[PDB]
Amino acid sequence: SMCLKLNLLDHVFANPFMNAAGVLCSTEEDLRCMTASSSGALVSKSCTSAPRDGNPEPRYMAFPLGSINSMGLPNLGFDFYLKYASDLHDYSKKPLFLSISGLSVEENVAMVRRLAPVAQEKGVLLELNLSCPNVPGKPQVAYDFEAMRTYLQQVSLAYGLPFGVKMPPYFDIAHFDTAAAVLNEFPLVKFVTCVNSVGNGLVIDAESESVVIKPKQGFGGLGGKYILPTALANVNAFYRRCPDKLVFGCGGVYSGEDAFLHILAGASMVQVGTALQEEGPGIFTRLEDELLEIMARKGYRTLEEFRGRVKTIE
Amino acid sequence: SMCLKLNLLDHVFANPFMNAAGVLCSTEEDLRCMTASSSGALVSKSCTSAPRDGNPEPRYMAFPLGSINSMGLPNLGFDFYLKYASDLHDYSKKPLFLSISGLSVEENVAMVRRLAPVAQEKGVLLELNLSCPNVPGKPQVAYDFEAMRTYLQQVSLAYGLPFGVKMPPYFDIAHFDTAAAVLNEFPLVKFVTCVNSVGNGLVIDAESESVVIKPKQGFGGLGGKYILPTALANVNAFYRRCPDKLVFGCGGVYSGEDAFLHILAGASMVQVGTALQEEGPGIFTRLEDELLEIMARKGYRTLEEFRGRVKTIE
Numbered sequence: 001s002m003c004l005k006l007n008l009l010d011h012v013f014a015n016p017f018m019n020a021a022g023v024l025c026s027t028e029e030d031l032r033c034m035t036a037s038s039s040g041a042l043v044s045k046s047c048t049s050a051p052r053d054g055n056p057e058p059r060y061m062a063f064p065l066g067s068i069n070s071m072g073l074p075n076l077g078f079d080f081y082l083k084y085a086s087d088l089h090d091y092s093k094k095p096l097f098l099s100i101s102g103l104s105v106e107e108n109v110a111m112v113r114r115l116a117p118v119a120q121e122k123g124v125l126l127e128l129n130l131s132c133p134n135v136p137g138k139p140q141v142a143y144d145f146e147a148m149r150t151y152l153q154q155v156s157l158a159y160g161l162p163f164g165v166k167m168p169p170y171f172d173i174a175h176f177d178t179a180a181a182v183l184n185e186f187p188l189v190k191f192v193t194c195v196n197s198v199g200n201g202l203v204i205d206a207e208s209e210s211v212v213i214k215p216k217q218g219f220g221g222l223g224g225k226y227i228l229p230t231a232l233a234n235v236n237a238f239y240r241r242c243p244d245k246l247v248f249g250c251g252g253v254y255s256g257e258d259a260f261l262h263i264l265a266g267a268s269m270v271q272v273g274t275a276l277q278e279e280g281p282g283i284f285t286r287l288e289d290e291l292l293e294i295m296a297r298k299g300y301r302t303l304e305e306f307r308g309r310v311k312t313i314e
Numbered sequence: 315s316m317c318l319k320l321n322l323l324d325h326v327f328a329n330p331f332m333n334a335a336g337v338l339c340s341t342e343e344d345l346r347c348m349t350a351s352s353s354g355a356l357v358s359k360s361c362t363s364a365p366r367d368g369n370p371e372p373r374y375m376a377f378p379l380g381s382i383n384s385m386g387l388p389n390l391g392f393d394f395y396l397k398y399a400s401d402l403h404d405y406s407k408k409p410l411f412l413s414i415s416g417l418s419v420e421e422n423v424a425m426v427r428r429l430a431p432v433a434q435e436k437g438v439l440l441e442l443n444l445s446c447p448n449v450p451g452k453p454q455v456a457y458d459f460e461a462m463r464t465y466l467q468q469v470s471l472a473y474g475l476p477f478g479v480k481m482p483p484y485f486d487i488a489h490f491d492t493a494a495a496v497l498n499e500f501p502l503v504k505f506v507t508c509v510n511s512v513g514n515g516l517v518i519d520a521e522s523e524s525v526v527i528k529p530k531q532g533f534g535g536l537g538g539k540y541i542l543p544t545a546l547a548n549v550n551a552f553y554r555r556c557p558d559k560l561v562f563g564c565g566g567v568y569s570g571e572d573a574f575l576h577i578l579a580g581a582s583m584v585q586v587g588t589a590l591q592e593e594g595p596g597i598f599t600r601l602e603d604e605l606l607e608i609m610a611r612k613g614y615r616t617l618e619e620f621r622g623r624v625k626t627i628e
């Protein structure tokens with residue numbers, strides 16, 4: 001109660017909230033809007049070496065229970081986000097994370113080598129997106145554990161500084177164990193963000209008998225209400241398996257209560273995607289007020305009092 | 315004159331609706347209740363060779379958006395379900411499916427060897443559950459493609475008659491492609507039921523700060539509203555990839571509209587889990603009336619006029 005400020009990764013944050021990568025963070029306008037908001041931090045749109053237009057529209061739709069997207073990695077290119085980080089962002093306002101999602105390991109290594117001096121000079125933080133396009137005959141990198149171990153080996157070497165990793169959801173305990181073990185081989189991986197969208201859902205409109213996004217025959221990643229228990233499970237699974245890392249929660253946050261659950265499950269930062277897309281950046285003042293109210297009601301004065309303290313039965 | 319009738323797998327169904335395995339189907343009382351209902355078919359609780367008590371309670375909980383469970387395969391044992399199939403079920407009322415979920419390939423083989431003559435004589439239909447664990451610390455069988463191929467080879471050889479398979483959801487296009495390719499190696503796999511519960515979610519209660527089920531530190535499979543776009547994607551993905559098989563839809567059905575979406579995605583039968591657990595078997599008359607109303611509004615007279623006809627954009 002009182003104030004939500006916290007310290008992590010050799011930075012100070014006013015509160016644990018931030019946007020999820022890809023939401024309100026693609027253009028200079030969007031990054032300035034996130035900076036002006038009451039969020040504790042912001043993350044940039046995942047970038048590639050070159051600018052991309054992304055997929056044809058419609059490519060995002062939202063509904064009462066959440067959203068579906070197949071954006072196709074539309075972004076202004078790494079040079080722009082790096083310039084934002086190195087010249088434009090006002091670090092006095094809040095910390096900045098830069099998300100990178102190159103289409104190959106080599107692309108990622110090349111970007112991280114460029115980011116490193118800006119990281120050292122300005123304190124921009126790297127979130128490596130371990131989600132991928134479809135390559136027939138090949139699953140996304142975080143779903144291929146030896147591939148994942150390679151990327152991280154090369155990035156760690158190339159980058160040489162503390163970073164984090166944006167994960168897709170897993171649905172199987174053995175996968176939790178294997179994925180966490182991979183991540184725990186890398187001491188430079190200081191945070192784990194759980195989760196990216198639940199992959200390849202399909203929303204159909206009954207009146208028109210049609211899928212609602214154009215790309216990929218309507219198939220796209222799900223966010224929002226649909227995915228909150230999945231997200232909670234991933235946050236908690238990695239919190240338990242990676243005691244020497246931070247876990248950032250992402251998925252299904254619409255209220256301070258939802259944020260409270262993510263923090264109980266183990267989240268240090270709490271990222272907001274769908275709900276921010278649909279409500280706008282005003283959501284951050286609401287979420288902070290709601291979280292402080294729940295804390296006050298419960299007698300909690302700090303996040304640390306309850307982070308990771310979800311109770312099990314017997 | 316509109317009609318919900320189907321004729322598949324050598325059987326006639328009054329309508330496409332049935333329970334999802336595990337819901338209202340464990341005991342003789344359950345089975346007789348499902349038989350008495352308006353459903354077009356029923357499926358028994360997934361069985362093992364020996365009776366099982368399942369996991370400690372609480373092991374199922376439901377909420378406005380769906381359910382979580384870790385039941386632990388509680389069942390009366392194979393001999394009970396076989397007896398029900400052989401001696402007790404009134405086939406004049408509707409078709410019966412028997413679900414099996416042995417804990418090893420050998421257990422499944424033993425069961426289907428003994429089921430075969432009753433399948434031939436009485437027409438009971440086998441649904442093989444491929445979300446069984448096999449070796450603990452390995453993923454569930456359907457998430458291990460080699461194990462899945464082995465189970466299907468062995469069961470095909472032992473059983474020798476058309477059967478179907480119950481699949482977990484997949485979230486990666488590469489997995490849809492691999493999984494369907496595996497299935498398409500087995501000509502006796504005549505139907506594919508998509509989907510089982512979305513694995514290892516975690517529901518947390520904010521007031522008590524506690525998980526809501528006891529087993530597995532609160533981790534369990536998700537059903538209900540959470541999972542409908544995941545279910546639809548899997549139904550459509552297998553419908554497109556397995557043109558010589560039927561697809562049965564399961565997941566997130568609460569209304570005739572939800573059923574209509576399943577059917578547009580490619581579903582033949584439509585199974586009802588969570589919603590049936592919550593509402594009871596009266597749900598089947600409501601689903602039939604609701605589906606018929608949508609069909610009337612659109613001018614459709616039979617299910618075939620729209621099964622699989624979901625539209626894509628462009």
Ligand SMILES: Cc1cc2nc3c(=O)[nH]c(=O)nc-3n(C[C@H](O)[C@H](O)[C@H](O)COP(=O)(O)O)c2cc1C
Pocket residue numbers: 020021022023045046060067069071099129166195196197222223224225227250251252253271272273274275277
């Ligand atoms: C429109 C849109 C674009 C996104 N783009 C990215 C991205 O560039 N990088 C990434 O890591 N995740 C991206 N995501 C995933 C979100 O960061 C987040 O993991 C997901 O939407 C789940 O959170 P939610 O339930 O709050 O929406 C995107 C999501 C949306 C809805």
Ligand SMILES: Cc1cc2nc3c(=O)[nH]c(=O)nc-3n(C[C@H](O)[C@H](O)[C@H](O)COP(=O)(O)O)c2cc1C
Pocket residue numbers: 334335336337359360374381383385413443480509510511536537538539541564565566567585586587588589591
């Ligand atoms: C209480 C409970 C028990 C279940 N037991 C089984 C089972 O024995 N075999 C099986 O194939 N699926 C089982 N399932 C999964 C359901 O058949 C179904 O695939 C899942 O609940 C998703 O459908 P829904 O959204 O309608 O709940 C069970 C589900 C619940 C809720």
Ligand SMILES: O=C(O)c1ccc2cc(CCCCc3c(C(=O)O)[nH]c(=O)[nH]c3=O)ccc2c1
Pocket residue numbers: 022046055069070071072073074101129131132133134196197215216221
């Ligand atoms: O040609 C296509 O249809 C297509 C479709 C999807 C593609 C996806 C990628 C990787 C997406 C990474 C960024 C991202 C996005 C996104 O930008 O679509 N959405 C999301 O929910 N999570 C993310 O991490 C990269 C290329 C893609 C290409």
Ligand SMILES: O=C(O)c1ccc2cc(CCCCc3c(C(=O)O)[nH]c(=O)[nH]c3=O)ccc2c1
Pocket residue numbers: 336360383384385386387388415417443445446447510511535
């Ligand atoms: O006692 C054990 O060591 C033990 C052994 C094997 C176990 C196997 C399972 C698999 C559950 C299959 C049935 C099933 C269930 C279930 O009965 O829990 N729930 C669900 O959502 N889908 C299903 O398909 C679940 C729990 C199991 C526990």
Ligand SMILES: C[As](C)(=O)[O-]
Pocket residue numbers: 022023024025026027030
């Ligand atoms: C707020 As926008 C269209 O740049 O994500």
Ligand SMILES: C[As](C)(=O)[O-]
Pocket residue numbers: 298299300
């Ligand atoms: C157990 As207390 C003082 O947070 O209600």
Ligand SMILES: C[As](C)(=O)[O-]
Pocket residue numbers: 336337338339340341344
């Ligand atoms: C209706 As029951 C407890 O046998 O699933």
Ligand SMILES: C[As](C)(=O)[O-]
Pocket residue numbers: 557558
């Ligand atoms: C024409 As067909 C339903 O047998 O693929």
